[PDB]
């Protein structure tokens, strides 16, 4: 709206969460990623800002998508795991890493959201360290 004084930043469509063209392939590592890693992060007191795609309009981050080219969030990851979108653990780990990276490159060091990301990432990496073979 020309009426706006403060810029608004529009949102992309959210990331895809299923892929009709891949077989339904379950592994112990993917089960662990959903049921141990994602679940432990999801229930953490700092998870809530990470649980859905960044809404740059509702959160007043009008420059978010200028800075972040590959958005990712734990809601998308959770859905991708539940839908068997991933071929392997590495692909899921990549999406968690993207989510954390986005936070670290958009927000200033020391920002509260960065401190939250750091606590979550520590837990994530602890859990990853115990990935079943």
Which residues make up the interface to ligand JCO (CB under 6 A)?
49-50, 54, 59, 103, 106-107, 112-113
CA 7 – CA 74 distance, rounded (Å): 27
Q: Which is nearer to ligand JCO, 55 or 82 (CB)?
A: 55
When the beta carbons of 65 and 87 are compared against ligand JCO, the nearer one is 65
CB of 88 to ligand JCO, least distance (A): 25
Measure the CA–CA gap between 109 and 26, rounded to whole angstroms: 38
d(CA 65, CA 38): 25
User: How far is residue 7's CA from residue 2's CA, in Å, rounded to a whole number?
Assistant: 10
CA dihedral (34, 38, 42, 67) positive or negative:
negative
Which of 75/84 has CB closer to ligand JCO? 75
User: Shortest distance, CB of residue 11 to ligand JCO, whole angstroms?
Assistant: 12
Residue 56 C-beta: closest distance to ligand JCO, Å: 9
The residue whose Cβ lies closest to ligand JCO is: 49
Q: Please report how close the Cβ of residue 25 comes to ligand JCO at its closest, in angstroms.
A: 30
Nearer to ligand JCO, 85 or 106 (CB): 106
Six-digit token string for 34: 């959903």
Question: How many Å apart are CA 78 and CA 3, to the nearest integer?
Answer: 38
Query: Is 54 within 8 Å of 69 (Cβ atoms)?
Result: no
């Amino acid at each position: 709206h020309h009426h706006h004084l403060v810029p608004r930043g529009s949102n992309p469509p959210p990331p895809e969460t299923s892929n009709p063209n891949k077989p339904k392939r379950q592994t112990n590592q993917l089960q662990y990623l959903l049921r141990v890693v994602l679940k432990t992060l999801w229930k953490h007191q700092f998870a809530w800002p990470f649980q859905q795609p960044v809404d740059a309009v509702k959160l007043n981050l009008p420059d978010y998508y200028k800075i972040i080219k590959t958005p990712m969030d734990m809601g998308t990851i959770k859905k991708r795991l539940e839908n068997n979108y991933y071929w392997n653990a590495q692909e899921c780990i990549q999406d968690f890493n993207t989510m954390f990276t986005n936070c670290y490159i958009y927000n200033k060091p020391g920002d509260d959201i960065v401190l939250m990301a750091e606590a979550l990432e520590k837990l994530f990496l602890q859990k990853i360290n115990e990935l079943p073979t």
